[PDB]
Amino acid sequence: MVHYKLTYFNGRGAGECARQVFALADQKYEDVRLTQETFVPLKATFPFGQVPVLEVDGQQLAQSQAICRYLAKTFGFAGATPFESALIDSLADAYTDYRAEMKTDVLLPARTKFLGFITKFLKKNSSGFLVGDKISWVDLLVAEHVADMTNRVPEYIEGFPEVKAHMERIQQTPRIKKWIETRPETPF
Amino acid sequence: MVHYKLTYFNGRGAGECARQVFALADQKYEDVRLTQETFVPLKATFPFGQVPVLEVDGQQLAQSQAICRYLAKTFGFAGATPFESALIDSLADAYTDYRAEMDKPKTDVLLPARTKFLGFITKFLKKNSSGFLVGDKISWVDLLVAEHVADMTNRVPEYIEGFPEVKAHMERIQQTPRIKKWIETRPETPF
Numbered sequence: 305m306v307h308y309k310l311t312y313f314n315g316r317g318a319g320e321c322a323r324q325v326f327a328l329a330d331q332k333y334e335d336v337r338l339t340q341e342t343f344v345p346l347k348a349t350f351p352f353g354q355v356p357v358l359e360v361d362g363q364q365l366a367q368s369q370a371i372c373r374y375l376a377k378t379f380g381f382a383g384a385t386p387f388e389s390a391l392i393d394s395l396a397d398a399y400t401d402y403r404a405e406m407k408t409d410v411l412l413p414a415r416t417k418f419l420g421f422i423t424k425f426l427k428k429n430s431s432g433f434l435v436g437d438k439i440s441w442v443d444l445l446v447a448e449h450v451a452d453m454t455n456r457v458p459e460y461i462e463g464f465p466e467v468k469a470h471m472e473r474i475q476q477t478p479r480i481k482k483w484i485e486t487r488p489e490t491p492f
Numbered sequence: 493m494v495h496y497k498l499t500y501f502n503g504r505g506a507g508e509c510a511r512q513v514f515a516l517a518d519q520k521y522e523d524v525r526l527t528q529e530t531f532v533p534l535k536a537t538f539p540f541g542q543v544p545v546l547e548v549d550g551q552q553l554a555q556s557q558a559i560c561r562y563l564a565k566t567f568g569f570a571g572a573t574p575f576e577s578a579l580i581d582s583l584a585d586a587y588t589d590y591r592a593e594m595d596k597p598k599t600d601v602l603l604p605a606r607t608k609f610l611g612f613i614t615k616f617l618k619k620n621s622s623g624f625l626v627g628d629k630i631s632w633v634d635l636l637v638a639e640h641v642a643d644m645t646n647r648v649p650e651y652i653e654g655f656p657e658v659k660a661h662m663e664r665i666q667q668t669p670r671i672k673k674w675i676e677t678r679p680e681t682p683f
Contacts, residue, residue: 352586352612365578367585374578390553390562397555398540404592421540 308333312356313343315490318368319356324444325372327483329379369396376441388436395425395434396442411457419464422446426466432473439477447474496521500544503681506556507544512635513560515674517567557584564632571627579626583633586612598648610655613637617657623664630668638665
């Protein structure tokens, strides 16, 4: 059988979306979790000296969004058409920009900008997903962040009811909900 | 016929890889180059308040790399298999990281950053006999890398010293007839 190994740290972080894509797919994988200590001397073994790295039948693929997208396309969670896939990619790029800009003072104004943009996509889509009529990897990516932020800073969601509903919808999807219940509890 | 409009500033910048995909595909498109002054009233109309934005038959798609990957898949420049396309993606994302890292700046940030990044790029080149980064055919990440390398080497001749394979790649890509033609004919801009 095809063999998937995902190497990351012992935390959600940049490895989590890939993990949730596997969960959605009901796909078995090897979940390898490194500590800072054991990672650092292994750096040269990875394509760009960083984690996460996926191995598919032993072949390495690095970079979190490249890994998520690859797995999503493999399992059917990257949109229905090429333009849908591209729209999902654009939202995921917008996310990475928003993360970079934070970088109370920084978290609030970053999120009103980003969540305003997200909300536009949600309101024009009757399905409840960000793009098209089916769950995608960017839904996972965004819902997980929003849950995380709302967990740490409860007023994160205030003023964004469509975004709240989306977070709840995605995180209650049976295979995601299960994964969230069963995954290792980590500070990040 | 399918109608493509690319909106960006009057420069290479974040719009150029898309322009070069179009060139490579011999696809006509509307190349809209805004001034800051005409951009201001248009900002609210873009998906994330920024450019570049592509319209395909009037439907907007924002974000540089999303645009390039889309165009590249449309036209056949995103690898031969799903895994190739993911490797290409991984290189473009490594590029992005490198750009984040990078006279005084030359020596303090540029050259260190480029040693690390060009080392990674060189490893990909030297394991592939074709002369491309991934697979046996040109892809959009070849375009993105070669353009950056050309640009930096224009600014800082020593950029390419130590990286002959990267230079060779830059020249191969930029002499590809449709790309050469575009480079010869594009507006000359400071960025």
